[PDB]
Amino acid sequence: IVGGQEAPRSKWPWQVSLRVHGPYWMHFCGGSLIHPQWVLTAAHCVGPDVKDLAALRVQLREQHLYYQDQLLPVSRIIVHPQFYTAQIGADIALLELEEPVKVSSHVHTVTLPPASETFPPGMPCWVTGWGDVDNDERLPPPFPLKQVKVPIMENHICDAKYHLGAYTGDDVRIVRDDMLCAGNTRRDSCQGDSGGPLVCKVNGTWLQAGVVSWGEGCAQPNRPGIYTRVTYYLDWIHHYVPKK
Amino acid sequence: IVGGQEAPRSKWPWQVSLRVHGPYWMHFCGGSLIHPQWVLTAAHCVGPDVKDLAALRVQLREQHLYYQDQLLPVSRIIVHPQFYTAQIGADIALLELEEPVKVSSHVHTVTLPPASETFPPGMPCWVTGWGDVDNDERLPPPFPLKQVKVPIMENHICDAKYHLGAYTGDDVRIVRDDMLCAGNTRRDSCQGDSGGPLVCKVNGTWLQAGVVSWGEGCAQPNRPGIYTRVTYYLDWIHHYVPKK
Amino acid sequence: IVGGQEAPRSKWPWQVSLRVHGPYWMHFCGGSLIHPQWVLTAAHCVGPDVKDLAALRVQLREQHLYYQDQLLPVSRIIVHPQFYTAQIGADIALLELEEPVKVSSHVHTVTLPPASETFPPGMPCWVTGWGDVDNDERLPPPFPLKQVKVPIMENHICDAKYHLGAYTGDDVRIVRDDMLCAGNTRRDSCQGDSGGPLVCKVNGTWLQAGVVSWGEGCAQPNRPGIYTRVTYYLDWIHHYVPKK
Amino acid sequence: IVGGQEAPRSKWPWQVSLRVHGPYWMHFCGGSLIHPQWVLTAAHCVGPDVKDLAALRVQLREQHLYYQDQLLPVSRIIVHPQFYTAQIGADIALLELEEPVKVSSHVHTVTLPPASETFPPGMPCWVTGWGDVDNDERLPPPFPLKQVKVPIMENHICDAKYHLGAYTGDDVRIVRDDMLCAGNTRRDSCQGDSGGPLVCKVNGTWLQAGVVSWGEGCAQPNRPGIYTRVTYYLDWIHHYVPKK
Ligand SMILES: *[C@](O)(Cc1ccc(C(=N)N)cc1)C(=O)O
Ligand SMILES: *[C@](O)(Cc1ccc(C(=N)N)cc1)C(=O)O
Ligand SMILES: *[C@](O)(Cc1ccc(C(=N)N)cc1)C(=O)O
Numbered sequence: 007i008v009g010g011q012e013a014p015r016s017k018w019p020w021q022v023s024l025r026v027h028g029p030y031w032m033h034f035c036g037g038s039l040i041h042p043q044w045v046l047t048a049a050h051c052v053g054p055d056v057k058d059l060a061a062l063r064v065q066l067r068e069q070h071l072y073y074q075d076q077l078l079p080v081s082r083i084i085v086h087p088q089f090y091t092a093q094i095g096a097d098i099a100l101l102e103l104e105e106p107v108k109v110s111s112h113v114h115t116v117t118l119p120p121a122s123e124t125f126p127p128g129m130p131c132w133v134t135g136w137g138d139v140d141n142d143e144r145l146p147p148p149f150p151l152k153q154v155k156v157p158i159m160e161n162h163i164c165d166a167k168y169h170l171g172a173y174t175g176d177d178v179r180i181v182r183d184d185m186l187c188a189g190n191t192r193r194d195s196c197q198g199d200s201g202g203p204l205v206c207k208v209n210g211t212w213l214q215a216g217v218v219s220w221g222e223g224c225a226q227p228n229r230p231g232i233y234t235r236v237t238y239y240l241d242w243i244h245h246y247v248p249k250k
Numbered sequence: 251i252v253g254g255q256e257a258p259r260s261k262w263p264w265q266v267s268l269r270v271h272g273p274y275w276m277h278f279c280g281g282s283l284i285h286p287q288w289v290l291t292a293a294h295c296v297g298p299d300v301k302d303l304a305a306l307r308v309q310l311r312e313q314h315l316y317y318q319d320q321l322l323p324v325s326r327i328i329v330h331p332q333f334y335t336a337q338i339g340a341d342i343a344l345l346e347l348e349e350p351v352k353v354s355s356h357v358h359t360v361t362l363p364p365a366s367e368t369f370p371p372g373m374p375c376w377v378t379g380w381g382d383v384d385n386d387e388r389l390p391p392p393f394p395l396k397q398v399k400v401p402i403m404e405n406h407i408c409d410a411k412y413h414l415g416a417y418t419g420d421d422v423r424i425v426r427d428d429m430l431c432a433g434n435t436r437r438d439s440c441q442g443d444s445g446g447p448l449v450c451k452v453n454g455t456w457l458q459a460g461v462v463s464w465g466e467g468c469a470q471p472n473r474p475g476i477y478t479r480v481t482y483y484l485d486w487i488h489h490y491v492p493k494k
Numbered sequence: 495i496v497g498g499q500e501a502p503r504s505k506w507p508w509q510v511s512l513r514v515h516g517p518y519w520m521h522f523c524g525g526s527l528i529h530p531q532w533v534l535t536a537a538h539c540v541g542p543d544v545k546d547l548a549a550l551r552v553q554l555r556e557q558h559l560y561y562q563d564q565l566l567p568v569s570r571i572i573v574h575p576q577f578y579t580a581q582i583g584a585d586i587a588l589l590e591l592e593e594p595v596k597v598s599s600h601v602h603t604v605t606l607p608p609a610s611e612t613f614p615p616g617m618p619c620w621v622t623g624w625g626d627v628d629n630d631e632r633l634p635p636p637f638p639l640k641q642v643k644v645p646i647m648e649n650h651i652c653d654a655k656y657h658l659g660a661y662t663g664d665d666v667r668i669v670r671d672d673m674l675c676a677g678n679t680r681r682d683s684c685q686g687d688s689g690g691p692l693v694c695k696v697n698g699t700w701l702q703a704g705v706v707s708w709g710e711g712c713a714q715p716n717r718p719g720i721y722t723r724v725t726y727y728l729d730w731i732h733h734y735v736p737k738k
Numbered sequence: 739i740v741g742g743q744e745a746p747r748s749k750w751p752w753q754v755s756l757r758v759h760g761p762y763w764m765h766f767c768g769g770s771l772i773h774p775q776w777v778l779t780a781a782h783c784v785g786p787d788v789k790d791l792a793a794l795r796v797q798l799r800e801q802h803l804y805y806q807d808q809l810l811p812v813s814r815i816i817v818h819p820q821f822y823t824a825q826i827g828a829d830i831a832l833l834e835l836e837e838p839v840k841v842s843s844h845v846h847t848v849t850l851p852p853a854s855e856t857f858p859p860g861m862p863c864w865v866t867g868w869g870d871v872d873n874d875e876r877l878p879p880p881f882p883l884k885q886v887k888v889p890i891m892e893n894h895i896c897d898a899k900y901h902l903g904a905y906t907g908d909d910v911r912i913v914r915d916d917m918l919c920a921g922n923t924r925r926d927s928c929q930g931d932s933g934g935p936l937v938c939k940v941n942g943t944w945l946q947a948g949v950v951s952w953g954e955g956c957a958q959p960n961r962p963g964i965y966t967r968v969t970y971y972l973d974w975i976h977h978y979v980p981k982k
């Protein structure tokens with residue numbers, strides 16, 4: 007997370023760390039607990055190539071990355087059939103936990119938005135994660151969970167900003183309708199934050215607007231971070247994730 | 251160039267090496283001389299972001315990479331307008347030389363293919379460049395120009411191979427129509443070969459079928475090399491490049 | 495610490511970690527508390543070149559490296575005058591803390607051996623530290639304190655081993671008299687443990703036999719770890735460290 | 739070679755490049771031809787740990803590092819028995835070529851200084867090599883052979899500087915008697931030059947004053963380059979290398 011501060015010990019009870027079997031289960035992406043047995047994350051964290059579930063393990067919310075690990079195995083990985091590359095969109099995926107978790111005040115789910123929310127500019131949205139604090143500036147130990155308040159931005163205004171300084175004709179759409187932009191030159195999600203959540207407090211309830219997807223560098227001018235529009239994949243998600 | 255051998259001192263007269271002003275003008279992509287004044291290459295080598303022409307410079311064909319440079323400045327860079335990402339297609343771009351070249355036996359142009367030629371499997375095709383001799387295995391000095399003979403693949407079988415081991419549904423074309431495939435587990439282009447020419451001998455003559463675009467690594471099984479199908483952009487090329 | 499295990503949360507009270515002011519106060523060497531206001535460590539961790547005290551910092555014994563840092567600043571650095579290189583010997587130094595520490599069950603001084611001791615082969619000795627667990631294999635997070643039990647080796651046997659496979663004449667001494675050897679092809683200290691302690695349980699008492707000084711790699715055949723022999727610099731240590 | 743320029747195609751006929759069989763025979767040190775069948779180089783380049791001659795190979799003087807290689811195998815390697823560390827001394831070794839060379843105007847031997855010769859402060863001495871051009875700044879291809887003119891410095895003055903900014907006592911001698919100093923903050927030998935010649939023109943003749951040995955960084959303040967004193971090991975050199 008570029009900019010921001012260390013999230014208070016009881017702030018994002020839905021945050022989860024996706025780990026791989028390295029020399030040690032090393033954090034490779036984030037995700038959010040949307041149902042006691044399902045995790046929502048970016049497909050590019052686990053695709054397009056098939057991953058062996060043994061190599062994967064989930065860590066629910068924790069204030070400092072490796073200090074109190076309690077790795078949960080995954081039972082099934084579901085990546086969107088249209089996903090190939092983040093720039094092409096559809097960068098989203100579900101990880102089914104082998105066993106349901108026991109929700110509490112410190113670990114409980116995030117609410118998906120209704121298929122009628124647009125998350126216009128002005129909304130108080132936040133991105134959270136344990137990713138780099140700047141370009142090629144990794145998060146120094148003790149790996150505290152950082153949060154940042156980012157500003158939504160009209161896809162159209164965004165798409166345009168992405169053409170400034172580029173050879174790409176304007177008739178060519180860079181920012182797809184299934185994506186959502188947010189951030190500025192000093193506030194942005196970054197490498198290692200992928201799969202994490204962008205949640206906005208709509209009418210008092212934290213809703214998950216998007217999933218950290220891609221971008222051209224961390225907090226670069228005219229290059230806001232791109233997130234997957236949750237509302238665009240609400241149905242697909244529900245094919246697997248029951249309502250309650 | 252995975253596989254292959256060092257190329258004869260008089261084999262690929264159209265080969266060029268694009269250089270960036272580093273500590274030195276180090277090579278970063280190849281090209282092909284298609285007109286005494288224009289260089290054909292992959293857009294991804296010089297785009298989508300705008301590049302400083304002074305920071306660029308073209309080196310004509312040579313047997314050993316930095317022994318006898320004779321750098322030529324580039325007058326204009328013309329990246330295809332629909333280009334944003336290699337996977338998305340349109341990975342082609344043109345470079346106009348400030349000054350023409352005095353063609354010879356060791357350095358002359360390559361014949362573009364006719365708009366009809368499809369280069370079906372069975373054609374003898376070669377790829378040329380100074381790139382990695384395997385994944386993360388950089389070409390050792392004296393940096394000899396290597397050539398390798400690759401087998402052409404039909405796009406539908408190429409697309410099919412690409413779906414093997416991938417979560418990406420089959421109704422999702424991974425290998426577009428403006429792309430071509432060539433290569434196998436022991437023969438293929440690799441990092442640093444991008445922008446290079448895939449040429450085939452069609453009826454006793456060397457035509458350039460494709461420009462080294464992307465791939466999922468180097469010489470990996472079921473992930474053959476993707477090249478920009480030249481015939482597709484034949485028109486566009488000609489809009490800038492005069493005939494002869 | 496190559497080989498071994500994670501140490502008990504109440505095992506090595508004298509352990510300290512030296513921190514350099516970087517992006518964060520990173521650990522660069524171990525060190526021991528031998529007096530509530532004096533830290534004993536290897537000269538190479540802080541010399542021969544003069545270091546600035548504002549950049550150096552001592553952290554007391556902690557189970558996991560960066561979790562609950564409580565940095566203490568250093569008042570003075572006293573390297574041994576005869577020091578320039580580890581191989582040449584005299585690899586020892588003292589760090590005067592700014593303020594005395596409040597000794598407890600978890601954090602208290604280690605007993606310096608009497609000038610009479612030798613710690614002959616067969617001594618139950620242990621080395622502890624937060625270093626590499628193998629050559630080029632850094633300590634994976636959460637950085638637990640490790641401990642490994644190592645066999646003391648007689649100098650003359652150790653010097654012979656150091657000649658096996660080397661060009662250096664036998665008459666030439668590699669292992670000096672102010673050095674001590676301990677370890678084998680499976681248990682040894684490593685990069686990062688430098689400056690730490692090698693304590694032995696002498697007649698029901700923990701005595702610091704040496705300081706992790708140098709070696710030709712971690713746990714390598716015919717190259718056991720070389721430690722500074724403390725009895726040798728006792729009088730020197732005492733010119734600054736009050737008795738009790 | 740920090741500072742200096744590319745040496746003329748006929749300036750250092752005695753120059754040689756030592757090569758280790760890697761992915762390719764990479765230059766790891768320089769040396770000099772002191773007799774048609776022996777090469778003199780710094781011991782640390784080939785010791786103290788025994789090396790396999792099948793992996794070493796000597797390339798004679800060549801203007802550009804890998805372009806026109808002609809590797810010669812070694813028959814015997816003789817490391818001075820007192821060697822173990824450069825800071826300790828006796829950094830000198832001899833490689834015997836399998837066959838005598840055919841010396842010529844471009845490739846022939848250098849003259850060894852007479853026992854008397856001292857090389858007073860200010861001497862017109864030169865260092866030549868294909869090493870780093872600055873700390874951590876490697877010599878970029880085409881790897882020209884570089885040279886630089888460095889001023890000799892008296893051992894007692896040089897040793898004085900090696901104490902400036904260092905804890906080491908003035909009573910402790912850092913710059914040993916079998917070493918020699920040369921260079922300054924903008925002209926100095928560097929990483930990869932080890933073993934190369936330090937020749938001085940003394941009364942019309944180029945005499946090999948020293949051998950690049952060690953130093954605390956390249957072109958660093960109060961840390962002039964330390965070379966091995968040749969006059970010092972003459973007798974030994976001659977115990978193997980015949981006179982003429
Ligand atoms: C993701 O962290 C990659 C990623 C995501 C988002 C941004 C951004 N600037 N918004 C940069 C990088 C991963 O895959 O590690
Ligand atoms: C290109 O060389 C990248 C590149 C090109 C081709 C392949 C391949 N497997 N055919 C892999 C990578 C560059 O950008 O340097
Ligand atoms: C020390 O840790 C260096 C060091 C010390 C000891 C050994 C060993 N094999 N016993 C290897 C390396 C430092 O300077 O970090």
Ligand SMILES: *[C@](O)(Cc1ccc(C(=N)N)cc1)C(=O)O
Binds near residue numbers: 767782933
């Ligand atoms: C030598 O090149 C190491 C070396 C020698 C001398 C200097 C110097 N500044 N005089 C720097 C480095 C090797 O072992 O590669």
